[PDB]
Amino acid sequence: PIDVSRLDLRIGCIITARKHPDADSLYVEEVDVGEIAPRTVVSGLVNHVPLEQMQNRMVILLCNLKPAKMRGVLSQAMVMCASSPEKIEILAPPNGSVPGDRITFDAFPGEPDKELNPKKKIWEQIQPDLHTNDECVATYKGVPFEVKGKGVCRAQTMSNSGIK
C-alpha cells in the first residue's frame, strides 16, 4: 500500500551549515534530529537562502531514504521545501516543535519503512501528491502535515505548490 505513511518525516534543527567547498550550489549541514549523533545533510539552497538563515533553523526532514554521497559527502536525510521555478521556501514546523518530533497524517496511519528501497521508487510515487494548501499548509493529498499536540507545518508564502 503506497501512501505518505511509508515516509519517516521528523522535525530537526540545523546546528551548522556551510557551503560545499567544491560546489557553489550546495550546502553541507549538521542536523539535530533527536538522535544520539547529528545527521549530515547536503541541500541545494545556496542560491535561494542566505547562510545566516540556515543556522539553528527548524526544518522538516525525510529520514528513511537510503544514504547517498553527494559530491563526496554522505547525505543522510532531505530537507523538505515548497518549490516552484521562481522560488523555494523551507517548510516550517509549528512553534514548540523539537528535534525528533514526528509528523503524522489524520487519514494515513502507519509506521514508516525502515529504509525506502531506491529500486521501488517509493519516494518518487509519493512526492507528486505532496503540496501546500491555499492556506500554505503542507499536505499529502490535502491532508495536513501534523505534529500531534503542536500544530501543522507550513510554507510562508507559497500556496498550492509542490513540495520536494
UniProtKB/Swiss-Prot annotation:
Where is the PTM N6-succinyllysine found along the chain?
K121
Q: Which residues form the tRNA-binding domain?
A: 3-104
So which residues are the signal peptide here? Answer: none
What's the protein called, per UniProt?
Endothelial monocyte-activating polypeptide 2
- From the UniProt record, report the name of the gene that encodes this protein: AIMP1
Full protein segment contained here: 149 to 312 of 312
